[PDB]
Amino acid sequence: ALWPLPLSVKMTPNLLHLAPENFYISHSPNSTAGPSCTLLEEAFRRYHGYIFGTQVQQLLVSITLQSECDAFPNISSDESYTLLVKEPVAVLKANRVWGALRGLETFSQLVYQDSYGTFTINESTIIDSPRFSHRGILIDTSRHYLPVKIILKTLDAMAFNKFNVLHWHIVDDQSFPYQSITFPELSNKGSYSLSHVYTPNDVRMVIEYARLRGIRVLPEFDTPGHTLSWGKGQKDLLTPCYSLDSFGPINPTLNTTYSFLTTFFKEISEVFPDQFIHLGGDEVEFKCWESNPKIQDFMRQKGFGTDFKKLESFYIQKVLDIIATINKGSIVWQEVFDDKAKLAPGTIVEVWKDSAYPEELSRVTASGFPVILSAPWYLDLISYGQDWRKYYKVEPLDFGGTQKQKQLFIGGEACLWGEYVDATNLTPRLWPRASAVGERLWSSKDVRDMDDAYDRLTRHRCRMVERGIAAQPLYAGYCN
Amino acid sequence: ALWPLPLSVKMTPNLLHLAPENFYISHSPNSTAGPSCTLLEEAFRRYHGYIFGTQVQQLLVSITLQSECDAFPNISSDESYTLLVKEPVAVLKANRVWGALRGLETFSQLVYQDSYGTFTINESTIIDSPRFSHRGILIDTSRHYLPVKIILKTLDAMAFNKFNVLHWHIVDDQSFPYQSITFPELSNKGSYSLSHVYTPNDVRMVIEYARLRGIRVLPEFDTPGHTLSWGKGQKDLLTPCYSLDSFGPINPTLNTTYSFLTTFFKEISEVFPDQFIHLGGDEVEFKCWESNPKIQDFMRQKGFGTDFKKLESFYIQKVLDIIATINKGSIVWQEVFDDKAKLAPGTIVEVWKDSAYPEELSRVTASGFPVILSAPWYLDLISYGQDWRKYYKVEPLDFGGTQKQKQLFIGGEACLWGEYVDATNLTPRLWPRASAVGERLWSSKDVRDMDDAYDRLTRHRCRMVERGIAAQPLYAGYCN
Numbered sequence: 001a002l003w004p005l006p007l008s009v010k011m012t013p014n015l016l017h018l019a020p021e022n023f024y025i026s027h028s029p030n031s032t033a034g035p036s037c038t039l040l041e042e043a044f045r046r047y048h049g050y051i052f053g054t055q056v057q058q059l060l061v062s063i064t065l066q067s068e069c070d071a072f073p074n075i076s077s078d079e080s081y082t083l084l085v086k087e088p089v090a091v092l093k094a095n096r097v098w099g100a101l102r103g104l105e106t107f108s109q110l111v112y113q114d115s116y117g118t119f120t121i122n123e124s125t126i127i128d129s130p131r132f133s134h135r136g137i138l139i140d141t142s143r144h145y146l147p148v149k150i151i152l153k154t155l156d157a158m159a160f161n162k163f164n165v166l167h168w169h170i171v172d173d174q175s176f177p178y179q180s181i182t183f184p185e186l187s188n189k190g191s192y193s194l195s196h197v198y199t200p201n202d203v204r205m206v207i208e209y210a211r212l213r214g215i216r217v218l219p220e221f222d223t224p225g226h227t228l229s230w231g232k233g234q235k236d237l238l239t240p241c242y243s244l245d246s247f248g249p250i251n252p253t254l255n256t257t258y259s260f261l262t263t264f265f266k267e268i269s270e271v272f273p274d275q276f277i278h279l280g281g282d283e284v285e286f287k288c289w290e291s292n293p294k295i296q297d298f299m300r301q302k303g304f305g306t307d308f309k310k311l312e313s314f315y316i317q318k319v320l321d322i323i324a325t326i327n328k329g330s331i332v333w334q335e336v337f338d339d340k341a342k343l344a345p346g347t348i349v350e351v352w353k354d355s356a357y358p359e360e361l362s363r364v365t366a367s368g369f370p371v372i373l374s375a376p377w378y379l380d381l382i383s384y385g386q387d388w389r390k391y392y393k394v395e396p397l398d399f400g401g402t403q404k405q406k407q408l409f410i411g412g413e414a415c416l417w418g419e420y421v422d423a424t425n426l427t428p429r430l431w432p433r434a435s436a437v438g439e440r441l442w443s444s445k446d447v448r449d450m451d452d453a454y455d456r457l458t459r460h461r462c463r464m465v466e467r468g469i470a471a472q473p474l475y476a477g478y479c480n
Numbered sequence: 481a482l483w484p485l486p487l488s489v490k491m492t493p494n495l496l497h498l499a500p501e502n503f504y505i506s507h508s509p510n511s512t513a514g515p516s517c518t519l520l521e522e523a524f525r526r527y528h529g530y531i532f533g534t535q536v537q538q539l540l541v542s543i544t545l546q547s548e549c550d551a552f553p554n555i556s557s558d559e560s561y562t563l564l565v566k567e568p569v570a571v572l573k574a575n576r577v578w579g580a581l582r583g584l585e586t587f588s589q590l591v592y593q594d595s596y597g598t599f600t601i602n603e604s605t606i607i608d609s610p611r612f613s614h615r616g617i618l619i620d621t622s623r624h625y626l627p628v629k630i631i632l633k634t635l636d637a638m639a640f641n642k643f644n645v646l647h648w649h650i651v652d653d654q655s656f657p658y659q660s661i662t663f664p665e666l667s668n669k670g671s672y673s674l675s676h677v678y679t680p681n682d683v684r685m686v687i688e689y690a691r692l693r694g695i696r697v698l699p700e701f702d703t704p705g706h707t708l709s710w711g712k713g714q715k716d717l718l719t720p721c722y723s724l725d726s727f728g729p730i731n732p733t734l735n736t737t738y739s740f741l742t743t744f745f746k747e748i749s750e751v752f753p754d755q756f757i758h759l760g761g762d763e764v765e766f767k768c769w770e771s772n773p774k775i776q777d778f779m780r781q782k783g784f785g786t787d788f789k790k791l792e793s794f795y796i797q798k799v800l801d802i803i804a805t806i807n808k809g810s811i812v813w814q815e816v817f818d819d820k821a822k823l824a825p826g827t828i829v830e831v832w833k834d835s836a837y838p839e840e841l842s843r844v845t846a847s848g849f850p851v852i853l854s855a856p857w858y859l860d861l862i863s864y865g866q867d868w869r870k871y872y873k874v875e876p877l878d879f880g881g882t883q884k885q886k887q888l889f890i891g892g893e894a895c896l897w898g899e900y901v902d903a904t905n906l907t908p909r910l911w912p913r914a915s916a917v918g919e920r921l922w923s924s925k926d927v928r929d930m931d932d933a934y935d936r937l938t939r940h941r942c943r944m945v946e947r948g949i950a951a952q953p954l955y956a957g958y959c960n
């Protein structure tokens with residue numbers, strides 16, 4: 001009942017038993033980590049509870065290289081590990097902390113109770129490492145505010161599924177819950193109310209909680225579209241519409257815009273330790289820009305004609321430059337690439353449009369850019385039945401391209417947009433549907449037996465329920 | 481923020497205030513009900529909590545006719561009431577208890593807190609009575625066992641939406657959680673486990689809890705199909721398949737079948753006080769019957785040829801006769817009617833097939849039978865977006881027929897089949913999507929303004945959340 005299925009699993013018929021008040025998880029004497037390592041100490045204690053909640057007396061954990069205990073995970077973090085389950089001492093070995101965390105999760109999935117309640121595990125050897133290194137979940141806290149607690153629960157569920165990126169789509173048109181220190185009015189005027197805000201301390205908590213599970217927090221502050229809530233607190237930022245709404249996208253012709261974005265993104269570069277900031281750039285509407293006289297003036301000032309993609313490109317290029325100047329990487333939705341903006345090498349493009357997405361993957365990778373797939377994994381788009389199967393069956397590298405292009409595919413994200421989701425329904429909708437995406441991104445390409453996937457996923461789902469994650473059923477049945 | 485919208489609402493701009501520890505709900509001195517009426521006393525206390533959780537000091541409740549306090553509700557129960565909100569004493573008047581319960585719900589939807597927290601209500605007069613008298617929710621506890629607590633919560637939510645029938649699809653192929661006293665082996669061998677069973681006392685609790693909210697409990701013990709779990713404990717009941725599964729539908733050629741069903745339904749007639757028992761009769765597969773030699777013998781014994789609809793009809797007619805002999809009414813899925821079984825007058829046909837359902841309504845009503853619609857309200861069939869709108873827009877009497885035929889349309893049910901539903905996801909999936917069906921069945925035919933429906937339903941949904949029902953959002957937004 002392993003989920004995701006490890007790279008290599010070799011088991012024996014030899015059963016070993018565990019005694020809850022006589023079973024410890026500890027540092028091997030040769031490890032680079034010790035009691036000082038908060039990350040490993042907290043993991044040891046919480047996995048003790050998950051496991052229990054002929055005798056293997058100890059699970060020794062050996063970190064081989066500089067542990068990276070006090071650091072934040074990044075895209076190249078080594079998550080590989082081996083697990084040797086034997087008597088009297090099992091051994092978890094990993095290059096870094098990140099692999100040990102993954103291995104602790106797998107160890108807990110190997111321990112089970114027999115018919116008489118006896119804690120049991122098979123003698124075994126597991127070798128494991130992920131297929132892709134970007135394995136994300138997108139949450140949307142603008143369409144509905146999500147309390148900190150449900151973000152923490154999602155992070156727990158992500159750890160159980162070996163996801164490593166929380167893509168936090170923190171703000172959007174409807175509300176601005178991010179409390180900015182340098183610009184207090186963004187949240188004061190843009191949030192749904194004062195109890196629908198994320199304080200600097202709420203943000204630190206999510207980041208720390210994520211780090212302890214080897215999860216990166218990738219902030220998205222989408223512009224120039226999806227910014228209506230930004231205009232409540234930052235005057236003169238948004239374009240006024242001469243007529244179909246009242247305000248449109250960010251005004252890209254004003255110097256106050258870029259001065260605001262410089263100061264703002266500098267704050268973001270300090271608050272969020274991850275190397276990458278998602279700049280968005282999706283679904284920019286041009287009707288407002290088209291109907292605005294000052295923008296029309298600006299359009300002819302540098303020969304953009306009637307092609308508003310060039311104005312969008314001009315805006316996005318200035319924002320990409322601001323991110324580069326503060327020494328961070330940028331991630332962008334495909335539109336930015338499709339509308340012919342000039343991107344610096346290293347800029348990650350996220351492919352989300354469901355029409356001809358394999359051909360989009362080819363174009364992006366052929367142009368040299370690293371790529372992330374979300375298109376077929378829009379979990380907000382619910383449907384009747386076992387839709388986990390369609391997410392599972394996706395083979396992400398079935399697009400046209402050389403091996404060099406396929407090496408630019410770094411991973412994917414399962415997206416849960418928030419128009420119809422809040423705390424009342426987020427968890428059942430997210431899990432175990434995202435578990436299908438988690439295996440596809442962790443496990444080998446050839447792991448696709450549907451009967452076996454169903455067998456392991458129902459049991460994994462029951463395990464998520466036992467641990468406090470209200471994951472919905474796959475089909476008729478029961479747990480325990 | 482009324483939901484469902486009452487028949488007639490007339491309000492004044494005059495505001496009156498309420499004092500929580502100086503506001504009582506009591507029996508008018510001329511009422512037929514008094515302190516002895518448990519049903520009204522418990523409602524008074526729980527609505528006090530819902531309301532609060534120039535001065536109107538009292539809400540007096542007057543029952544005009546024999547109250548029916550100690551009785552179970554039935555199809556012809558009078559749920560009409562008037563509500564006069566004035567100072568110092570408001571008055572709720574109803575023919576029976578059933579109308580007073582509806583009126584208490586409406587009264588609580590009229591009380592609100594202003595910006596400074598002051599409990600306020602407008603002076604007003606409301607006259608109300610339902611458009612249809614059968615207003616049901618179908619729950620399925622076979623595909624997944626639902627704990628008693630979530631059935632009780634659903635009943636609370638139903639009361640808030642003025643639904644009056646719990647259609648309890650208690651058993652099916654996958655499990656038999658109904659503990660039968662006369663046949664203990666049905667649950668002992670057919671349930672998912674011994675903790676996935678409904679004891680006689682669990683059943684009484686649900687019935688009583690329902691009664692206190694004016695809700696009828698309609699049991700469904702579906703036969704001859706949907707009976708695989710029945711065969712674990714009752715040997716020789718199901719037809720053995722000569723080959724695609726192992727067992728098929730109930731064997732209709734054996735006398736032990738009918739002797740079993742007589743004893744069984746007699747137990748059901750005593751356990752469930754409602755006048756009606758749903759016999760099911762949907763999706764009977766003939767391949768097993770066709771492949772069975774003894775059934776082939778039986779088929780020629782009374783000239784049924786190769787038409788297995790006649791054997792199904794023969795079976796169903798014997799079951800309808802058993803129900804008639806114990807003095808109960810029968811409800812049946814449309815297939816029983818479509819396959820030309822002879823139904824006694826009064827037999828209710830439930831139309832569930834989504835293809836040409838208006839024409840099905842015509843055929844059933846033209847033949848003289850009372851009809852219930854579920855076809856367009858299959859809430860298990862989820863989809864992206866505001867699907868509450870499609871359920872709301874259904875106008876049930878848009879079928880071909882005379883006024884006499886339209887008088888045979890007694891109501892409808894919103895169905896939540898259980899293949900993909902259990903305690904982790906039932907509530908968010910059910911509410912407020914079923915609220916759309918509740919208004920369509922309670923309110924006037926001409927109540928269909930979508931903007932107004934959206935305005936009242938978001939607020940109603942926030943009210944359900946405040947009262948402990950985790951109803952999912954309609955669209956982006958927030959509560960409070």
Ligand SMILES: *[C@@H]1O[C@H](CO)[C@@H](O[C@@H]2O[C@H](CO)[C@@H](O)[C@H](O)[C@H]2NC(C)=O)[C@H](O)[C@H]1NC(C)=O
Nearest residue numbers: 001009010011012013014015016121122123124
């Ligand atoms: C883990 O060990 C158990 C116990 O030996 C294995 O289970 C049995 O396998 C043996 C030999 O294949 C069979 O004779 C038994 O019928 C199996 N069950 C029982 C009750 O002992 C199990 O296969 C092992 N796990 C793996 C994948 O190797």
Ligand SMILES: *[C@@H]1O[C@H](CO)[C@@H](O[C@@H]2O[C@H](CO)[C@@H](O)[C@H](O)[C@H]2NC(C)=O)[C@H](O)[C@H]1NC(C)=O
Nearest residue numbers: 481489490491492493494495496601602603604
């Ligand atoms: C309930 O009473 C309130 C208060 O009088 C009504 O609200 C106001 O209506 C008056 C006159 O139409 C307006 O001058 C106010 O602007 C309204 N609000 C306030 C703050 O007083 C409300 O309309 C009444 N409800 C109904 C449907 O009759």
